[PDB]
Amino acid sequence: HARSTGSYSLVTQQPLGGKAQFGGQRFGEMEVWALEAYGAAYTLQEMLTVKSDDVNGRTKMYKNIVDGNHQMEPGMPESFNVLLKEIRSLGINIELEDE
Amino acid sequence: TKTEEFDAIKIALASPDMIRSWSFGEVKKPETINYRTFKPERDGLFCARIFGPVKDYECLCGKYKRLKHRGVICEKCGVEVTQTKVRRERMGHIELASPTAHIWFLKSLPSRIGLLLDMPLRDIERVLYFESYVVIEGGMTNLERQQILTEEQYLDALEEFGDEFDAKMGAEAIQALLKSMDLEQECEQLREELNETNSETKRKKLTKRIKLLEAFVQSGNKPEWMILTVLPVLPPDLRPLVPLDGGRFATSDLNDLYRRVINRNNRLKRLLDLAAPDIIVRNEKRMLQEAVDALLDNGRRGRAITGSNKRPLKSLADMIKGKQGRFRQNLLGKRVDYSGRSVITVGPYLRLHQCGLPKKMALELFKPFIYGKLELRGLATTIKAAKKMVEREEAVVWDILDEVIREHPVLLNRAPTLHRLGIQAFEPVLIEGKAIQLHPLVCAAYNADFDGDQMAVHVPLTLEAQLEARALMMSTNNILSPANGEPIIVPSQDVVLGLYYMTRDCVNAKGEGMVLTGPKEAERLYRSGLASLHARVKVRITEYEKDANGELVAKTSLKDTTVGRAILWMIVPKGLPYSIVNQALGKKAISKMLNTCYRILGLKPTVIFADQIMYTGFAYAARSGASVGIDDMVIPEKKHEIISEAEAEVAEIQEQFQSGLVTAGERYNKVIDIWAAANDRVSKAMMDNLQTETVINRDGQEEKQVSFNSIYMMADSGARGSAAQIRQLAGMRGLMAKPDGSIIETPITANFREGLNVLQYFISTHGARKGLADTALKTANSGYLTRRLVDVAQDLVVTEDDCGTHEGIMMTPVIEGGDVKEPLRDRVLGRVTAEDPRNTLLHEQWCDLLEENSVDAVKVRSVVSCDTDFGVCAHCYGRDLARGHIINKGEAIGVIAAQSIGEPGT
Amino acid sequence: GGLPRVADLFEARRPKEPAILAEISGIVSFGKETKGKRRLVITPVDGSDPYEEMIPKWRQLNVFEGERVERGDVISDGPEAPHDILRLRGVHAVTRYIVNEVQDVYRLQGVKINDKHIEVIVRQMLRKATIVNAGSSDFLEGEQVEYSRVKIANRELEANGKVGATYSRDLLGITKASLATESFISAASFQETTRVLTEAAVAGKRDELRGLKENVIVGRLIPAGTGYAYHQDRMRRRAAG
Amino acid sequence: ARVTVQDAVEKIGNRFDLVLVAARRARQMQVGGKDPLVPEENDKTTVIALREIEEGLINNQILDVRERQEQQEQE
RNA sequence: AUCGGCUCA
DNA sequence: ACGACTGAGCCGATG
Ligand SMILES: [Mg+2]
Ligand SMILES: [Zn+2]
Ligand SMILES: [Zn+2]
């Protein structure tokens, strides 16, 4: 099995197993342990954004490896935007403070 | 506020006007969709006039299309024409005609209402569930406050004095109760109250009330919002409305709850200002508020609802917990792209850094690497035109692939990742098939084996990702282990037997009395076919030692070694003495070469040298014509005697059973020691009647030579075959236990060269079907143990430049009466000192120089004793054992610590 | 037990039949008797004259009718308990008790784990001290040991609030010192989320994104390894201002 | 640098600032051309950043002092 | 997508 | 009184 691009499940903007392609491989927390142990700062940044979630930056990074730039340019994954919207509607105030 | 560079987060309660702000329009009607055509109804749970349209910059009705009208506030369909993704963020609400007791502030013990009002939990239900009243204000009816009264009586309270006396009913009672209970009041009534009648564990709740009140108004909350005055609703995209395959509708439990709730809130509104029969009503403030203590959190009161199959309905609550929410969906349950999967295979031609990637795989990964370095080279005019040349399987495609894989490494993963070596980087090259290939040494570093296994295969993108995958994660840093001071990547299994077969000593083979003119003449005298790998002979060697500074030292000498031994001296990288290889090298003493090669020289030639052993290991492994014959399953000569003399030693104690020199109960164990005596009476007529078995002599006639037996050699080399296994195979199987533990009357006599008795199999059944049923929860419990342990010591990092005090903890060698394992040289290693240098490292080269003084009494500045803000000071710790140097400001101490208990937790 | 031996040790719960370490040093003698007991007396000469304790009913003792007992003696046999030695001696042999039980399990199987690895966690266990005197907030309570030095090294000098706060010692093994993360982010990834996210609401708790688990979730860079020197430049601008 | 980077690690000092001294240098030689100094042995901009450390060159002291040079040439 | 079923590391 | 492994495969069935 393999993966590099395709489609994503509506809610959690992440891959789904079925037609077009198989299941895209999973990245666990016991797996992240290894990334936490090595100096895997930049790698762990791409994982959670430009490989799975990020709606405006995962695909807007796409043409920086094509264009021959090789760069990040991330922002914010939606799984949090879910978690935020769940807590506001669970019954709480919670938000982002700035500089 | 505009720029989104977030720095900090705060949490707080849910005010009415606040939740209203997040909301854009009330979820007034409780509708989903018009079962005719799939359009989210007018005022329903789904609707664009609230949440935005069902497409990009479009509407429902159909005047405004494509893009133009950016934020055109329409009406006939009702859409502020924005991109629909608003349906992932915008909210609505449901204004309750009856206040609804929120649950998370109530039935989460010990009640955030209970010790905020000085009260239990059973109580608050009674008035809110609907049986009794409660008092509020201090006036004139002699009922004070927070009193409890079941309906009947209340008649004589507003029929005695009256006027100044408040007492309503419902959740509503708890609402208006929290309104007027002044908090400049309640607070300063317990700081001169803990003065004498304190007690020692009656004051365990009196200190649970001082915290909760003090931290409340100073944050800017105030407790009115405890009970929900108004209900928030989710965005439409998140709760997914999706009609799957067969004209059929797919939605999770969210919706089934949100509805009914409103079906009562509309029965409610049409029966608040439409005649209020207040006993026909208690049917409503009940059932409505009984469904929000089901929405928010289903399973709390008492397994209230079910689906359509007698199994519980999931809730807003269990969208975080249940190991499967949006908390274990940001780390654990996290799918990743630019990767693949396949089964693992050997690769005995590879040099360490080299993986064997399935060409197929590489290609379907590196697609957006190739597209762009094709357009740049001038072979394509668009991305899509290249989308045909790729799929066509055009030749030039694979050309670019070879120069892309050139200088672009890979991540290679095996689950379970118990520690950190479970992932490493290996610079791949191309090799076609469906299968992935790998090294057989890192076999041990990974939790790995070639038998039915699988590896996922990521790709690090950014320049950084690549280089830090090379700098750290790469296999080349990981020869030494994190947990301890031993290299994990060692000559496993086969590579071993080659060297034993090679180096193994002798006195007669093919000719002798030779000399050779260097290491080169040796190789001639083998592969041609003029000698064997044996024959003890004096050999010319040009060993280069290291000078004090280095390195004008070129020694010459002529020493005794065998044909075998000396061949490998070729691959021993110049800078090394000789006495290391001078012997019959088992994996044990082969791992020496590495460890000695690592610290005398460095990292850059240990990798080359060692990988080049591996080849040279397998080389003579195969050549040997080695095998597993039923001949070399030799039985001890007089086995049928040792069982037989001890079998009639059973028939002598049973002449004494019912009588009396030994009693009836203790029988079970008197012979068990003489049974267990024979256990290893025979294992030493086996490692003595197969240990040095030769006796066919070329040189005149003599006896002593190491065995020609294939199996034993594995137990002498350290290939595979423990000194307990060997027994069971062609010796004695011996003693087994019960499901309980008590050993059987007759342990096994036979083995696997000869045939077993049915009983004898049928018994062992237990022994191994217990010891493997353990493994059903062995990989389960270690993972529960590891995680738990990591989560306490993970929020932690390296910090200061130095922590400075003369302090620590004792180290004085272990002596359990008379038995030692690790004394001074390999325990106190690496410990940072504080007396005399003081405050310098005790290297691998140092407790040699602190063994020669007859060294005693030690105290060392370590991790517990760390006068260091939040972290580990580094200069008061030890060493990063995943390296041959001092610890560095960065490597997070905590993760590693718990990690190193999972690894050997297996 | 067998395998969860390892678990129990870091877990912190008292075992089966512990001992009785003579808590204070002095002229330690017994007094009175019922069935097979003797009420102990330990009165220090200094200020704290009061002190009395008793024992269960099958312990045989190694201090008879007045011998030189110090801060306890190896009195009655069995596997000792965790909590008291931490209260009594200090934090010097209490850690070596955590090591000289766990290890031999591996030394029969055949594994080494250079001992200082147990400390990293044991420090993350031994933390969460309890302070003696009334200083800035309450007698007992839960506050970090090195926070009590944001207190003890802090209070005894500047300002005008003179009340020193010398420390005392508790053990909270994994599932107990784990609970007390004042950082709702990492807190809710391994405990019952309910009990924190509600006490999150009450007091107005924050999480200023210092952690490792913490930084990860939000889609940010870790403060460790290569991401160390990055989070040296962003956390330093909270004070430069 | 394909086999083992042990020489270029201890030059700058550690393995973490072999990243942000080489990431910054792997960035500079990928965008606006920039000079290839030690023979571009086919290779790519990945190795090059590190390869300049293996022959007595690129360091953090040479990337924050020479960025002032491209702020003295555009006036 | 929740649950149920069953294999291999 | 509480606490429940780490990967992905294949099939099945109803909000
Ligand atoms: Mg296997
Ligand atoms: Zn319209
Ligand atoms: Zn220290």
Which among C11, C10, C16 is positioned nearest to C76, based on CA atoms?
C16
Domain of A62, in residue numbers: 14-99
Instruction: Show the DSSP H helices in B321-394 as ranges.
Output: 359-365, 367-370, 372-375, 383-391
Residue A5 belongs to a domain: no
Query: What's the CA gap between B593 and B609, in Å, rounded?
Result: 10
Q: What is the DSSP string of B583-602?
A: S---HHHHHHHHHHHHHHT-
- Residues forming a β-bridge with B33: B40
3 state SS of C30: strand
B339-345/B436-437 β-pairing: parallel
| CB-defined contacts A:C, below 8 A | 46
Burial (CB < 10 A; 0-12, 13-18, 19+), residue B635, is middle
Are the C-beta atoms of residues B354 and B428 closer than 8 Å to each other? yes
Please list, in sequence order, all residues whose beta carbon lies within 8 angstroms of the beta carbon of residue B693, skipping any fewer than 6 positions away.
Answer: B634, B707, B708, B709
Which among B40, B24, B22 is positioned nearest to B255, based on CA atoms?
B40
Q: Taking the CA atoms of B772, B775, B776 and B777 in sequence, report the sign of the dihedral they define.
A: positive
Mark yes or no for CB contact D30/A39 under 8 Å. Answer: no
Q: What is the DSSP string of A24-90?
A: PPEE-HHHHHHHHHTT-HHHHHHIIIIISS-TTTSSTTHHHHTTT---------HHHHHHHHHHHHH
Query: What's the CA gap between B37 and C1, in Å, rounded?
Result: 65
**Chain D residues within 8 A of A64 when measuring between CB atoms:** none
Q: D5 is written with which tokens?
A: 């980077």
State which amino acid sits at residue A16.
Answer: L
Ligand having the closest approach to the CA of B447 = 1
Provide the number of structural domains found in chain D. Answer: 1
3 state SS of B616: helix
Of D15, D19, D30, the CB nearest to A70: D30
Query: What's the CA gap between C219 and C223, in Å, rounded?
Result: 13
Query: What's the CA gap between B397 and B403, in Å, rounded?
Result: 11
Are the C-beta atoms of residues A68 and B373 closer than 8 Å to each other? yes
Q: What is the maximal distance between C-alpha atoms in chain B?
A: 129
Which among B812, B824, B810, B801 is positioned nearest to B876, based on CA atoms?
B801
Are the C-beta atoms of residues B332 and A47 closer than 8 Å to each other? no
Provide the number of structural domains found in chain A. Answer: 1
Q: Which single residue has its CA nearest the C1' atom of nucleotide F8?
A: A23
Please list, in sequence order, all residues whose beta carbon lies within 8 angstroms of the beta carbon of residue B85, skipping any fewer than 6 positions away.
Answer: A55, B52, B237
In 3-state terms chain D splits into helix, strand, coil percentages (rounded to 5) of 30, 0, 70
Which among B357, B344, B350 is positioned nearest to B439, based on CA atoms?
B350
State how far residue C217 is from chain A, nearest Cα, in angstroms: 8
| CB-defined contacts A:B, below 8 A | 249
Residue B415: which region, alpha, beta or left (left: phi > 0; alpha: psi -120 to 50)? beta
Are the C-beta atoms of residues B546 and B553 closer than 8 Å to each other? yes
Query: What's the CA gap between B105 and A30, in Å, rounded?
Result: 33
Are the C-beta atoms of residues A33 and B420 closer than 8 Å to each other? yes
Please report all neighbours of B, defined by 3+ CB atom pairs within 8 A. Answer: A, C, D
- Experimentally, the structure was elucidated by X-ray
Are the C-beta atoms of residues B878 and C85 closer than 8 Å to each other? no
Q: What is the maximal distance between C-alpha atoms in chain D?
A: 44
B536-541/C52-53 β-pairing: unpaired
Q: A88 is written with which tokens?
A: 């506001």
Overall residue count recorded for chain A in this entry: 99
Q: C95 is written with which tokens?
A: 């850690």
Q: A63 is written with which tokens?
A: 């043409």
Which among C173, C129, C84, C91 is positioned nearest to B809, based on CA atoms?
C91
Please list, in sequence order, all residues whose beta carbon lies within 8 angstroms of the beta carbon of residue B102, skipping any fewer than 6 positions away.
Answer: A91, B226, B227, B228, B292, B296
Please list, in sequence order, all residues whose beta carbon lies within 8 angstroms of the beta carbon of residue B235, skipping any fewer than 6 positions away.
Answer: A85, B51, B86, B87, B88, B89, B90, B91
Please state, as a whole number, how many other Cβ atoms lie within 10 Å of the Cβ of residue B834: 18
3 state SS of B255: helix
Q: Tell me the CA–C1' distance in angstroms for B309 and E3.
A: 9
Query: What's the CA gap between C183 and C189, in Å, rounded?
Result: 11
Query: What's the CA gap between C193 and B318, in Å, rounded?
Result: 10
Query: What's the CA gap between B595 and B486, in Å, rounded?
Result: 8
B411-413/B92-100 β-pairing: unpaired
Q: Taking the CA atoms of B111, B112, B116 and B122 in sequence, report the sign of the dihedral they define.
A: negative
Q: Tell me the CA–C1' distance in angstroms for C239 and F5.
A: 43
Q: Which single residue has its CA nearest the C1' atom of nucleotide F9?
A: A23
Residue C161: which region, alpha, beta or left (left: phi > 0; alpha: psi -120 to 50)? beta
Residue B775: which region, alpha, beta or left (left: phi > 0; alpha: psi -120 to 50)? alpha
Q: Taking the CA atoms of B41, B43, B47 and B53 in sequence, report the sign of the dihedral they define.
A: positive
Query: What's the CA gap between B241 and B252, in Å, rounded?
Result: 9
Mark yes or no for CB contact B464/D19 under 8 Å. Answer: yes
Of B102, B383, B413, the CB nearest to A91: B102
Distances (CA, A) of B498 to B346, B491, B518, B583, B584: 17, 11, 22, 14, 11
Q: Tell me the CA–C1' distance in angstroms for B439 and F6.
A: 23
Q: C200 is written with which tokens?
A: 């999150």
Are the C-beta atoms of residues B519 and B544 closer than 8 Å to each other? no
Query: What's the CA gap between B104 and C194, in Å, rounded?
Result: 7
Are the C-beta atoms of residues B410 and B316 closer than 8 Å to each other? no
Q: At what angle do helices C94-109 and C116-126 cross, to 10 degrees?
A: 140
Distances (CA, A) of A3 to A19, A61, B425, B464, B611: 13, 17, 19, 22, 32
Which among B35, B126, B24 is positioned nearest to B80, based on CA atoms?
B24
Are the C-beta atoms of residues B523 and B498 closer than 8 Å to each other? no
Query: What is the gyration radius of the CA atoms in chain A, in angstroms?
Result: 16
Instruction: Show the DSSP H helices in B132-207 as ranges.
Output: 171-179, 183-187
Domain of D8, in residue numbers: 1-75
Query: What's the CA gap between C235 and C223, in Å, rounded?
Result: 10
| Nearest 10 degrees: Cα torsion B666, B667, B670, B676 | -120
Query: What's the CA gap between B540 and B559, in Å, rounded?
Result: 7
The helix (H) or strand (E) run that includes residue B614 is helix B604-623
- Residues forming a β-bridge with B810: B859
Closest residue in B to C191 (Cα) is B321
Which among B83, B42, B36, B86 is positioned nearest to B60, based on CA atoms?
B42
Mutate to test the interface with D, among A45, A70, A73 (most CBs of D within 10 A): A70
Query: What is the gyration radius of the CA atoms in chain D, in angstroms?
Result: 13
**Chain A residues within 8 A of B337 when measuring between CB atoms:** 3-5, 15, 24, 51-52
Are the C-beta atoms of residues B711 and B628 closer than 8 Å to each other? yes
Dihedrals phi, psi of C23, to nearest 5 degrees: -65, -35
- Residues forming a β-bridge with A93: B12
Distances (CA, A) of B818 to B813, B814, B815, B821: 12, 9, 6, 11
**Chain D residues within 8 A of A69 when measuring between CB atoms:** 30-31
Are the C-beta atoms of residues C115 and C99 closer than 8 Å to each other? yes
* Distance, first Cα to last Cα, chain B: 52
Strand E bases contacted by the protein (CB, 7 Å): 1-3, 8-9
Please state, as a whole number, how many other Cβ atoms lie within 10 Å of the Cβ of residue B657: 12
Are the C-beta atoms of residues B27 and B42 closer than 8 Å to each other? no
Query: What's the CA gap between B276 and B294, in Å, rounded?
Result: 26
Residue B693: DSSP 8-state: -
Report residue C214 CA to chain centroid gap: 25
Burial (CB < 10 A; 0-12, 13-18, 19+), residue C158, is exposed
Distances (CA, A) of B373 to A70, C5, D35: 12, 58, 20
Instruction: Show the DSSP H helices in B648-730 as ranges.
Output: 667-670, 672-679, 710-717, 725-730
Query: What's the CA gap between A85 and A82, in Å, rounded?
Result: 5
Query: What's the CA gap between B849 and B837, in Å, rounded?
Result: 12
CA of B450 to the centre of ligand 1 (A): 7
| Nearest 10 degrees: Cα torsion B498, B499, B505, B511 | 60
Instruction: Show the DSSP H helices in B348-506 as ranges.
Output: 359-365, 367-370, 372-375, 383-391, 395-405, 463-468, 494-503
Q: What is the resolution of this structure in A?
A: 4.7
Closest residue in D to B605 (Cα) is D4
Please state, as a whole number, how many other Cβ atoms lie within 10 Å of the Cβ of residue B450: 12
Q: Taking the CA atoms of C185, C186, C192 and C198 in sequence, report the sign of the dihedral they define.
A: negative
Query: What's the CA gap between B115 and B710, in Å, rounded?
Result: 76
Report residue B388 CA to chain centroid gap: 42
Q: B366 is written with which tokens?
A: 């590196």
CATH of the domain at D73: 3.90.940.10
Are the C-beta atoms of residues B326 and A82 closer than 8 Å to each other? yes
- Residues forming a β-bridge with C54: none
Mark yes or no for CB contact D27/B890 under 8 Å. Answer: no
Exposed e or buried b for every residue in B270-297, given b needs 16+ CB within 10 A? ebeeeeeeeeeeeebbbebbbbbbbbbb
Of C184, C192, C213, the CB nearest to B795: C213
Q: What is the DSSP string of B743-758?
A: PPSS-B---SSSPPPH
Please list, in sequence order, all residues whose beta carbon lies within 8 angstroms of the beta carbon of residue B810, skipping any fewer than 6 positions away.
Answer: B858, B859, C92, C96
Query: What's the CA gap between B444 and B447, in Å, rounded?
Result: 6
Query: What's the CA gap between B80 and B52, in Å, rounded?
Result: 7
Q: D73 is written with which tokens?
A: 């040439």
CATH of the domain at B678: 1.10.132.30
3 state SS of B670: helix
Exposed e or buried b for every residue in B794-832, given b needs 16+ CB within 10 A? bbbbbbbeebeeebbbebeeeeeeeeeebebeebbbbbb
Query: What's the CA gap between B315 and B103, in Å, rounded?
Result: 13
**Chain D residues within 8 A of B351 when measuring between CB atoms:** 3
Any idea which residue has 């051309």 for tokens? Answer: D33
**Chain C residues within 8 A of D17 when measuring between CB atoms:** 229
Residue B575: DSSP 8-state: B
State which amino acid sits at residue A19.
Answer: K
Query: What's the CA gap between C170 and A21, in Å, rounded?
Result: 55
Contact with chain D for residue C229, Cβ under 8 A: yes
Query: What's the CA gap between B619 and B614, in Å, rounded?
Result: 9
Which among B449, B523, B11 is positioned nearest to B221, based on CA atoms?
B11
Ligand having the closest approach to the CA of B452 = 1
Q: Tell me the CA–C1' distance in angstroms for B309 and F11.
A: 20
Which among B434, B439, B410, B435 is positioned nearest to B423, based on CA atoms?
B410
Query: What's the CA gap between B240 and B248, in Å, rounded?
Result: 14
Q: Tell me the CA–C1' distance in angstroms for C98 and F6.
A: 28
Mark yes or no for CB contact D5/B608 under 8 Å. Answer: no
Q: Tell me the CA–C1' distance in angstroms for B308 and E4.
A: 14
State which amino acid sits at residue B235.
Answer: P
Half-sphere exposure of C82 (CA within 13 A, CB side): 21
B427-431/B557-562 β-pairing: unpaired
Please list, in sequence order, all residues whose beta carbon lies within 8 angstroms of the beta carbon of residue C169, skipping any fewer than 6 positions away.
Answer: C86, C87, C90, C91, C126, C129, C130
Domain of B716, in residue numbers: 638-770
3 state SS of B387: helix
Dihedrals phi, psi of C169, to nearest 5 degrees: -125, 135
Strand blocks (E) in B157-271: 228-233
Dihedrals phi, psi of B11, to nearest 5 degrees: -115, 145
Of D15, D30, D31, the CB nearest to A39: D15
State which amino acid sits at residue B724.
Answer: A
